[PDB]
Amino acid sequence: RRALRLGVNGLPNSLEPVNAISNVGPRIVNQIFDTLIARDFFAKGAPGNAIDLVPALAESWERIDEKSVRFKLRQKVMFHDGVELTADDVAYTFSSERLWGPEAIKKIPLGKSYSLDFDEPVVEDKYTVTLRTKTPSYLIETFVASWMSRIVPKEYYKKLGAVDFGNKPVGTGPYKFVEFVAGDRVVLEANDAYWGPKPTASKITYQIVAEPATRVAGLISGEYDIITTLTPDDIQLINSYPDLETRGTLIENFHMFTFNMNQEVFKDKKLRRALALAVNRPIMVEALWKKQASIPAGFNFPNYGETFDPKRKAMEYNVEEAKRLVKESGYDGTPITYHTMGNYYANAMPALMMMIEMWKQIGVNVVMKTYAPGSFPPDNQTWMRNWSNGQWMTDAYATIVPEFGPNGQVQKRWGWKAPAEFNELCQKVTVLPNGKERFDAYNRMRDIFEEEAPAVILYQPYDVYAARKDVHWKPVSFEMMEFRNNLSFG
Ligand SMILES: O=P(O)(O[C@@H]1[C@@H](O)[C@H](O)[C@@H](CO)O[C@H]1O)O[C@@H]1[C@@H](O)[C@H](O)[C@@H](CO)O[C@@H]1O
Numbered sequence: 001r002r003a004l005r006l007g008v009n010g011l012p013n014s015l016e017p018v019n020a021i022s023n024v025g026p027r028i029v030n031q032i033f034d035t036l037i038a039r040d041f042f043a044k045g046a047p048g049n050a051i052d053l054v055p056a057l058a059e060s061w062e063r064i065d066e067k068s069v070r071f072k073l074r075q076k077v078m079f080h081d082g083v084e085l086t087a088d089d090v091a092y093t094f095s096s097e098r099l100w101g102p103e104a105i106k107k108i109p110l111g112k113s114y115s116l117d118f119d120e121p122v123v124e125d126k127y128t129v130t131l132r133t134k135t136p137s138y139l140i141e142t143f144v145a146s147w148m149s150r151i152v153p154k155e156y157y158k159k160l161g162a163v164d165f166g167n168k169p170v171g172t173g174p175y176k177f178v179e180f181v182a183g184d185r186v187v188l189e190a191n192d193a194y195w196g197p198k199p200t201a202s203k204i205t206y207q208i209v210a211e212p213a214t215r216v217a218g219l220i221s222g223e224y225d226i227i228t229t230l231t232p233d234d235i236q237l238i239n240s241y242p243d244l245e246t247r248g249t250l251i252e253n254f255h256m257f258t259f260n261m262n263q264e265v266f267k268d269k270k271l272r273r274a275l276a277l278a279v280n281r282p283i284m285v286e287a288l289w290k291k292q293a294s295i296p297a298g299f300n301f302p303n304y305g306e307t308f309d310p311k312r313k314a315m316e317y318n319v320e321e322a323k324r325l326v327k328e329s330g331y332d333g334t335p336i337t338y339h340t341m342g343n344y345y346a347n348a349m350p351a352l353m354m355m356i357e358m359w360k361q362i363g364v365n366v367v368m369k370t371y372a373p374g375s376f377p378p379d380n381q382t383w384m385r386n387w388s389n390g391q392w393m394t395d396a397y398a399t400i401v402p403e404f405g406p407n408g409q410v411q412k413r414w415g416w417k418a419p420a421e422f423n424e425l426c427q428k429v430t431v432l433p434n435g436k437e438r439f440d441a442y443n444r445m446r447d448i449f450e451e452e453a454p455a456v457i458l459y460q461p462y463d464v465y466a467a468r469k470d471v472h473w474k475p476v477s478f479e480m481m482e483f484r485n486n487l488s489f490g
Pocket residue numbers: 021022023024253374376386387388389390391399403479
């Protein structure tokens with residue numbers, strides 16, 4: 001079989017699947033591991049955006065009541081080191097010890113804040129396990145299909161510990177670990193003992209090429225089979241080569257900028273709001289995205305299903321109100337830094353250059369500060385920074401509650417003093433079933449989010465890849481690459 005060569009924007013600092021949650025980790029850990037339930041993006045001929053959930057490590061499952069789901073595990077599934085998958089591995093994956101309890105904070109810093117209100121799993125037998133929540137949760141199934149729920153081997157993971165496991169991962173997935181050179185490459189090889197569709201590449205190499213121009217050159221020269229994280233300005237050149245093409249899709253993620261609200265100038269909402277109200281998103285979408293990016297009506301996305309609000313108004317744009325907020329905030333004209341890891345995010349620096357000019361027109365002076373991969377700056381040296389959030393559930397709970405809620409990092413680490421009402425609503429939507437009360441609570445949370453501006457949503461990126469026409473592979477509407485029954489050569 002052909003070896004697959006990928007030129008990527010970046011690499012995660014660990015292959016521990018929860019710590020690898022980012023724009024760059026899932027395309028790798030999706031190959032090493034499996035989940036109990038998987039999303040089939042290609043269900044019923046869909047162009048990589050189907051919402052259908054299908055059996056994966058769980059052959060079947062059944063919701064018992066408002067807070068428990070029983071899973072019947074596929075038998076004779078082997079981890080890469082030979083160990084057979086059992087309910088004990090699944091129980092460990094979703095345990096207090098490894099994932100969501102207080103002891104897990106050191107190993108998986110965001111484990112607890114991104115998890116449901118789990119109770120300890122119950123192992124019924126070697127192939128039967130029940131996942132439970134202490135309080136009602138109708139999100140167990142969507143959680144279990146998500147990037148939080150890749151199944152790790154209990155004994156091997158405990159032996160190494162989360163850090164060393166992150167450098168030598170073992171999973172049940174179609175590709176097994178070969179090597180990891182931090183900040184340079186990850187190499188995987190075919191797991192020919194895979195339980196599902198057999199791997200079609202002999203090897204996969206994820207080679208970091210941080211500068212997108214160099215990545216495009218690598219595809220043109222024949223060094224890479226597929227490249228990631230391009231902008232729509234690269235489409236015409238790549239498609240001019242008869243043996244190459246672009247493959248793009250709008251993904252269930254939003255780009256944003258956010259603030260270190262421990263900094264004096266951002267403790268209060270006024271200047272955060274001034275900066276938010278001066279962003280002309282449609283002009284950025286036209287200039288940098290060739291109309292392909294999508295601007296959402298607040299923290300509100302169609303993948304939320306029953307908790308998506310299609311009637312919501314656009315996020316405000318008001319240059320004159322922004323000018324008045326700069327004056328009322330007492331802002332004295334001092335430059336404010338905005339950190340970016342180059343173009344880790346497609347259009348990060350071009351968007352920042354536009355926003356710097358928009359902010360100059362309201363009297364705020366912003367300056368770019370770049371940081372290298374793996375060297376995220378110290379928190380107290382950051383003021384503004386760019387970020388993104390993958391919308392990882394078929395529900396509005398994610399990402400507003402896990403990221404911006406009372407137990408989340410935006411309030412605890414980055415100092416957002418959220419109104420008490422916002423936190424009360426976060427607690428309510430966590431346990432309520434779908435209905436008018438829950439739907440209205442998310443809309444009020446969205447309104448407070450826009451009023452407070454702890455972050456400023458820019459748009460959903462149009463994720464552009466480029467590939468050799470002789471490498472058959474279709475993108476999916478999420479920040480990952482799927483190769484199961486979706487990778488062939490010739
Ligand atoms: O690639 P990202 O946008 O964010 C990562 C961030 O996690 C990491 O600290 C930083 C330094 O290496 O690099 C990127 O900015 O990944 C986010 C993730 O942080 C978030 O938890 C998830 C759900 O909201 O969405 C991702 O897109």
